[PDB]
Design a protein around this ligand. Sequence first.
Ligand SMILES: N#Cc1cc(=O)[nH]c(=O)n1[C@@H]1O[C@H](COP(=O)(O)O)[C@@H](O)[C@H]1O
Ligand SMILES: N#Cc1cc(=O)[nH]c(=O)n1[C@@H]1O[C@H](COP(=O)(O)O)[C@@H](O)[C@H]1O
Lengths: 213, 214
Amino acid sequence: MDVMNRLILAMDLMNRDDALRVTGEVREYIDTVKIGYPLVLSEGMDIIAEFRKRFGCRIIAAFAVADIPETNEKICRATFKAGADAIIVHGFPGADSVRACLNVAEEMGREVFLLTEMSHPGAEMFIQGAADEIARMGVDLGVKNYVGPSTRPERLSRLREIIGQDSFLISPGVGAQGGDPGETLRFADAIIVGRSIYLADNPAAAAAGIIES
Amino acid sequence: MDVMNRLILAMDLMNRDDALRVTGEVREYIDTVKIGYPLVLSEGMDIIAEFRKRFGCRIIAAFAVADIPETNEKICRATFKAGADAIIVHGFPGADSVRACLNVAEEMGREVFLLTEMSHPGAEMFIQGAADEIARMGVDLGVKNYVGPSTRPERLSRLREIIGQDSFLISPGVGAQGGDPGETLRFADAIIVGRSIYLADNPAAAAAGIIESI
Ligand SMILES: N#Cc1cc(=O)[nH]c(=O)n1[C@@H]1O[C@H](COP(=O)(O)O)[C@@H](O)[C@H]1O
Ligand SMILES: N#Cc1cc(=O)[nH]c(=O)n1[C@@H]1O[C@H](COP(=O)(O)O)[C@@H](O)[C@H]1O
């Protein structure tokens, strides 16, 4: 995936009008948009088609997939049918759940991102201790795309080590959760940014600002 | 929560027509339906309102919520606005992510179910070794409703031990994944059943048969 400006917009606004406006305003800067459940549960899967029609930006469905293999397969099918380029899947439910998603993505020609360690404080309780093994599981399964935390650069460094230079790594937690764009991009290929852009008075200026830095 | 016949239907059919037809066939037996992302992503969140209108069943949103606190809060907000009575939330992302869901549920008069240990084989890799501690975290947070695996009755037993007899416990993995209805109801208050009913030739007979076995 060639992410324009190394910057992925996390569009977690929950009404259609505002989400469309803000994404439109930053389209000169960003060609890849991460759409998750706050927007999808508010406006429907039809929102993915709408973004493709309006903007011709790649769409990553941030659905943190975390069910049994049979249900993960259905979720991936529904999400790729709607037009997502990629889906984010949790590794902590284990290898069979991840494989189920890889099998659908292989079949429909789309991508899986493996979420390895999360960026919020609570991630320290259980996920962090499992994360290096989760990332190594991903590599053994042939996963090529990963997600790891902007808020813990030492952990993001370790996860880049495990997955190698050829793997693709994107990282949330920049801005509102306290991660730095520059320090993150020493390990991640691209940064994910939501609130620092979408809650700005001038989203385009906020995006331009991050990019210029 | 009083689940009729201790049986919750997991409605994971992916089209509106089949989902409404199958649910209508078993409505005599079941007043609680677990609706997950397979149905919601195929048909929209309006399907929740439509089930309440047609059936008046309780709806548990099986969304395995597993994001950062701020995002979990927005998912719970959207879900309860859509008319879900309860939502399923993962414990593995930690206490702050579960507390975000509890906060919204409290504000809206809804219930959070904490998914401790999952029922599929992959659960053994990472989740199982954290599951007792996740359950203890639930107790510490004041969680009253939990989910644990029919496929590992000794783990389900341990979950019931940790949370005590006054917490409510529901359990998937019955039928298709190899769990036994009667054995699971030694420890769980209610069982979740999907494919054994909704893939049956006569779903009504499948549900009646299950209820008879218990
Ligand atoms: N993907 C993902 C996910 C995993 C993680 O560990 N940390 C996150 O912040 N996220 C998501 O990234 C986005 C971060 O947005 P923000 O820049 O903090 O506003 C949100 O959509 C959040 O749900
Ligand atoms: N809730 C939940 C979930 C957590 C888990 O550990 N195991 C499950 O099977 N489930 C869900 O319960 C249902 C079990 O359905 P079935 O009876 O195996 O067809 C599915 O909706 C599955 O996604």
